[PDB]
Amino acid sequence: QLTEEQIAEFKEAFSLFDKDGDGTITTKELGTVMRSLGQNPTEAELQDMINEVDADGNGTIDFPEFLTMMARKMKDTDSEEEIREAFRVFDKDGNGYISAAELRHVMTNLGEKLTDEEVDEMIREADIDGDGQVNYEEFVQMM
Amino acid sequence: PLKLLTNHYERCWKYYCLPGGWGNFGAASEEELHLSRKLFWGIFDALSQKKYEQELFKLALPCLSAVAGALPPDYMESNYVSMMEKQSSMDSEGNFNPQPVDTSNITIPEKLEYFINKYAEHSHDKWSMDKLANGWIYGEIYSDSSKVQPLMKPYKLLSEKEKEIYRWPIKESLKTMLAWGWRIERTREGDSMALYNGYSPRAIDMSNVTLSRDLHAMAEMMAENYHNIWAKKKKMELESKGGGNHPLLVPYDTLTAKEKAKDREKAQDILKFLQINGYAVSRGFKDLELDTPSIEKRFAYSFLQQLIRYVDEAHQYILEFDGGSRGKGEHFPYEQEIKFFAKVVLPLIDQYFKNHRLYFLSAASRPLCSGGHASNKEKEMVTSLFCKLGVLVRHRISLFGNDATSIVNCLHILGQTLDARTVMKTGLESVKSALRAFLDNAAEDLEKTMENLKQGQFTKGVTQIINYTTVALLPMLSSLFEHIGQHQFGEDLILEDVQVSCYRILTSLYALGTSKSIYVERQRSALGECLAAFAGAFPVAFLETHLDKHNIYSIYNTKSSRERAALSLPTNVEDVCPNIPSLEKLMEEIVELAESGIRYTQMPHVMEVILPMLCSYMSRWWEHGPENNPERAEMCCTALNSEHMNTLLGNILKIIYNNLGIDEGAWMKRLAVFSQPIINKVKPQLLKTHFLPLMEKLKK
Ligand SMILES: [Ca+2]
Ligand SMILES: [Ca+2]
Ligand SMILES: [Ca+2]
Ligand SMILES: [Ca+2]
């Protein structure tokens, strides 16, 4: 039922939590993401989390189990809404087009240390249209 | 292993590509280079004849790209090959076949007998010193309890069979390296010495002797051979015993230093004794010749023929699919080949020509003086691959699984990598005609697009091919013009009948820029940037003909009157480029735009296109005008003055001030982006005292 592109979108999301790449998210592997986002989960909580989703009972979430819980969440159009939401909060300029000038603020916002001149050099290929300022259209192709 | 190889060849690419390599680590010994070339070709062939598995094919392509990047494109393929390669040693069954070299057929020469006897005496001497150090003493009877040995007599009093026990290892150690071919000679020094000619044995404290470094390598190989021999007859003992695997049966490479110690020691002692006798040992092979000028052995040469004919059967397969499109069954065994093409060949081309951008452009002209020489016929076949890719991508968008964008990407970077050495000095006539048939065919293809768009404006096959044209062809030819302009190859690359094709393409683009539609809106950027290329940095003087008649390069003057009147040559500049307005017209147009300032809603494409034009012919001739050289005046194609840029740039930034009020512009940022090169070429301290409005208008 799920779109094959949405399958591929859940591929990359599934591998985002699966750093070791074995296709299984352990409790500690999941825990690292939660701590990276600032939240301190107890080990018992993490087990309760995975157990509810782990139909197999192996203690580690597999992708088919991951898809079933994806279907359980009504994320029908939230993906591009988040992408659209990302585009507007990224465009702090509010012009509907994000300029390399604001790119220096946002690199500090995430915490990335990629150098600014390269960011402009990448934004010359990120902008296939070339606008020198990224719109929603050039935002989606980048995503 | 695929990922391991990818990571290694990405991290240590400088070790292989750069002649210096890593400063601390060094460079390859050419054996690593041979191994890497063999790996690249083996993986490439296996992937070519391998059935498509998605994960395997997505992991193999990065490995191939990394290996190609690491390999020098001018790599020297050694005619010298390796010595009896141990592929069968690491066989699947048993994992270690320790086959040694056969020495029964070979026989040791006679002159070595003096060396044999002296080394046998030396071995017996160290033997005796060792075990009268352990406490063994000469006696008449052999008693183990008292540790007395009748064999403690000197070498002369030793029995004949007692001398043979030393001789046997000596002659096999000589025969294994003689059968290998290694030349052993002995100098006039040793010959003079041989002519000169309870015992207390005093052997040479040989530990202080040291070998040459090649000699260390030779000792290594002969030690590996000795271990293979030992492992061979040990293994025979193992099948006789029916089990009991010895822990030391593992190969020489897997062995540790302690395990290798005795075998190495045997190698060094025998070689050092040979040196101390003065016998001269050397490699078993004579270097015959190195064919450096030959392009055949170039890695880039081999890679390009591989790519060239792969694209060849790819194109004729696409012809077969077009011929079978009349039929019902589109499923063919060639699905494997076309997925291989679209998933490997194009990405490999892209990565290779990204990593080796400098190599194919400058054949060791001045960047990287150590090397980087690309062969001239390699250059012309790079141009041939360019042409053939351009022809192959023509009308195959549906067959391409949305990878047409990747094809255009590879094509335009290959166009950037294009160089004109072949056309200036020596180029194959077939290749020249083929690729410029490509150029002119693109010309009438854009033409037939304009007539079909004027016949039926409705927008199927013709619509998708119009999208193909406005996405690939025009940006492609514009990037062609860009690299020719930046390399200054124009005025001599575009001499004859090419300038006719260029006027044709020029008029076509000009009618495109005067026509308006949704496709024209989509190609607004391509039109603007190609006409840019044209009308301030571009090779020919298509606007100013009044001084072109005096140009030596000028088309009519280069080809006299006979053929000009004969062929399809319109006898006048205004005849060959009719719809083009002159400089007077196209710059009074600029000035009237300046005092007018039309709103973007009515006449948009004019102010969206008209400035970058001026930007890429006008300054071809801002450097080329008399303001740089008072001599060679009136020889110039056209006359253009720093004051002329002063006027036109005043025009453009004033209309930019007018521009900032119309929805702030992604397209006025078009003009800004394409103008930083223009204003950077512009002499800056003009920009000061004239930039005053731009900072308050810019912080707005
Ligand atoms: Ca995992
Ligand atoms: Ca599970
Ligand atoms: Ca903005
Ligand atoms: Ca853009």
Side-chain angles (χ1 to χ4, degrees), chain A residues 50 53-62 65:
Chain A
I50 279 170
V53 186
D54 187 359
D56 298 341
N58 52 316
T60 56
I61 302 308
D62 56 73
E65 263 175 1

Short mmCIF file of all heavy atoms in Angstrom, two decimals, chain A residues 50 53-62 65, ligand 2:
data_model
loop_
_atom_site.label_atom_id
_atom_site.label_comp_id
_atom_site.label_asym_id
_atom_site.label_seq_id
_atom_site.Cartn_x
_atom_site.Cartn_y
_atom_site.Cartn_z
N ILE A 50 10.59 -0.45 22.61
CA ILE A 50 10.87 -1.38 21.53
C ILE A 50 9.94 -2.59 21.60
O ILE A 50 9.50 -3.11 20.57
CB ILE A 50 12.35 -1.78 21.57
CG1 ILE A 50 13.19 -0.69 20.90
CG2 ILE A 50 12.59 -3.12 20.88
CD1 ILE A 50 14.68 -0.85 21.08
N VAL A 53 6.69 -2.22 19.79
CA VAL A 53 6.82 -2.31 18.34
C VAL A 53 7.34 -3.67 17.88
O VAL A 53 6.95 -4.13 16.80
CB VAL A 53 7.73 -1.18 17.81
CG1 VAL A 53 7.75 -1.17 16.29
CG2 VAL A 53 7.28 0.16 18.36
N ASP A 54 8.18 -4.32 18.67
CA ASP A 54 8.79 -5.60 18.29
C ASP A 54 7.73 -6.69 18.36
O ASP A 54 7.45 -7.28 19.41
CB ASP A 54 9.98 -5.91 19.18
CG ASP A 54 10.76 -7.13 18.71
OD1 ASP A 54 10.36 -7.75 17.71
OD2 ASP A 54 11.77 -7.47 19.36
N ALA A 55 7.12 -6.97 17.21
CA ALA A 55 6.19 -8.09 17.12
C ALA A 55 6.93 -9.42 17.21
O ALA A 55 6.42 -10.39 17.79
CB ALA A 55 5.39 -8.01 15.82
N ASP A 56 8.13 -9.49 16.63
CA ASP A 56 8.91 -10.73 16.67
C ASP A 56 9.32 -11.07 18.10
O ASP A 56 9.31 -12.25 18.49
CB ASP A 56 10.14 -10.61 15.77
CG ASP A 56 9.78 -10.41 14.32
OD1 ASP A 56 8.63 -10.72 13.94
OD2 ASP A 56 10.65 -9.95 13.55
N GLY A 57 9.70 -10.07 18.88
CA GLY A 57 10.23 -10.29 20.21
C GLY A 57 11.73 -10.45 20.29
O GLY A 57 12.25 -10.80 21.36
N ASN A 58 12.45 -10.20 19.19
CA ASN A 58 13.90 -10.34 19.21
C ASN A 58 14.57 -9.23 20.00
O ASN A 58 15.78 -9.29 20.27
CB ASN A 58 14.45 -10.38 17.78
CG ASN A 58 13.96 -9.21 16.94
OD1 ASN A 58 12.79 -8.85 16.98
ND2 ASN A 58 14.87 -8.60 16.19
N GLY A 59 13.82 -8.20 20.38
CA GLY A 59 14.36 -7.08 21.12
C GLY A 59 14.97 -5.99 20.26
O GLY A 59 15.39 -4.96 20.81
N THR A 60 15.04 -6.18 18.95
CA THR A 60 15.58 -5.19 18.03
C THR A 60 14.62 -5.03 16.86
O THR A 60 14.18 -6.03 16.28
CB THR A 60 16.97 -5.60 17.52
OG1 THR A 60 16.90 -6.90 16.92
CG2 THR A 60 17.97 -5.63 18.67
N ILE A 61 14.32 -3.78 16.51
CA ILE A 61 13.33 -3.51 15.47
C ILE A 61 13.93 -3.78 14.10
O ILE A 61 15.02 -3.28 13.77
CB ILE A 61 12.82 -2.07 15.59
CG1 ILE A 61 12.21 -1.82 16.97
CG2 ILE A 61 11.80 -1.78 14.50
CD1 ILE A 61 11.16 -2.84 17.37
N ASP A 62 13.22 -4.56 13.29
CA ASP A 62 13.56 -4.79 11.90
C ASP A 62 12.73 -3.86 11.02
O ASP A 62 11.76 -3.25 11.47
CB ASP A 62 13.32 -6.25 11.51
CG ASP A 62 11.90 -6.70 11.80
OD1 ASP A 62 10.98 -6.29 11.06
OD2 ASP A 62 11.70 -7.46 12.77
N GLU A 65 8.93 -4.69 10.62
CA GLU A 65 8.29 -4.21 11.84
C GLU A 65 8.24 -2.69 11.85
O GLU A 65 7.26 -2.10 12.33
CB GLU A 65 9.04 -4.74 13.06
CG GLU A 65 8.42 -5.98 13.67
CD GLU A 65 9.25 -6.56 14.80
OE1 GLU A 65 10.31 -5.98 15.11
OE2 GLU A 65 8.85 -7.60 15.36
CA CA C 2 11.92 -7.14 15.82
#
